[PDB]
Amino acid sequence: PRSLKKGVFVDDHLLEKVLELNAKGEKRLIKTWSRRSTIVPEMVGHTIAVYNGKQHVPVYITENMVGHKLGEFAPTRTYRGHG
Amino acid sequence: IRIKLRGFDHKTLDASAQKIVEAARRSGAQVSGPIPLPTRVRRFTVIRGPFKHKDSREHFELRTHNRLVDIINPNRKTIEQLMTLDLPTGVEIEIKT
């Protein structure tokens, strides 16, 4: 996985948004295209309407899911099965 | 005293590798016979057909024959006359000491 010599890479733009609400006043319903961008410990609480090719899935983050990426809570596939 | 010859047409490459042996010898004084540096074959394999048909190809190779030459007993009468050389086209040459 992503190097450690190479720090946790966030889009930086997705990143200003969050810290802009962390002290100035959270929270609002952002609609990120950022999936690469790891979840981060200034983002919990927020309602990052992450995108997935077609729409923005709201996913309120918590102290039980961050080390992953935003591409890991907005599914790209919808599969109720076969038959 | 190194002189290197390089080209694709071995025939032309050779024909060159002779004059520079004929020449420097006359003016002198000592020259080391040509040595055919083995060939770096750059082959390329492409399917004949312009679409599928994996099973019918056609090879096309590239032959970079190479010839190295020297001048033991050098002499500038050799050198001077050397810069006056009508060496063919398909050939690159290098000279070292």
Binding site: - | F8, T89, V91, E92
Partner: protein, 206 residues
């Protein structure tokens, strides 16, 4: 859907290449384009002249171009004008010590491509397909030749049904390397389709 190309099948055996020069792993992909590019412009401007084959030699910052055309007068122009106006727009794009000769064609009809080109005109002149195809061969065989062939495939006679019709005369063996079979396909653009125009010429065996 089979026959192997006769020129690549006689390179260094029966017929030597055109662009003559050796480049390293670094300039040779570039040289190719600069040479291909040249054959582009010439094939457009010399087209009227009757271009047959453009040899290219390189060396050091320079590059030698040979042009074999049966009618050198056109490409040259007054006192070399047309031929002299080509040594400027020439290096304009290529940009490097560039020469440009113009060899004299003993007989053009002994030039397969230069033969097929003509016919390709005629057909676009609405002539008789089956006619000239035979016409050319007689002209070739009268041209001291001992082997000639001309092939035409496509919507013949305007017809919706495609079709291949071709003629020959004398010896034209296609598995004989010791046998200079000149080659050359000229193409015809037509309101009603396109016509591939193939033509082979046995000039002799050494």
């Amino acid at each position: 859907g089979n026959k192997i190309h006769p020129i690549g099948f006689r390179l260094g055996i029966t017929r030597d290449w055109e662009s003559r020069w050796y480049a390293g792993k670094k300039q040779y992909r570039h040289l190719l384009l600069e040479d291909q590019r040249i054959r582009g412009l010439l094939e457009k401007e010399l087209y009227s002249a009757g271009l047959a084959r453009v040899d290219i030699e390189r060396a050091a910052d320079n590059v030698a171009v040979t042009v074999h055309v049966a009618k050198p007068g056109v490409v040259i122009g007054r006192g070399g004008e047309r031929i002299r106006v080509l040594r400027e727009e020439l290096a304009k794009l290529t940009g490097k010590n560039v020469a440009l000769n113009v060899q004299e064609v003993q007989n053009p009809n002994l030039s397969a491509p230069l033969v097929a080109q003509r016919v390709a005109e005629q057909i676009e002149r609405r002539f008789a397909v089956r006619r000239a195809i035979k016409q050319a061969v007689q002209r070739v065989m009268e041209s001291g030749a001992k082997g000639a062939k001309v092939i035409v495939s496509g919507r013949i006679g305007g017809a919706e049904q495609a079709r291949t019709e071709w003629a020959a005369q004398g010896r034209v063996p296609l598995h004989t390397l010791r046998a200079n079979i000149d080659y050359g396909f000229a193409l015809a653009r037509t309101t009603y389709g396109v016509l591939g125009v193939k033509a082979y010429i046995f000039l002799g065996e050494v």
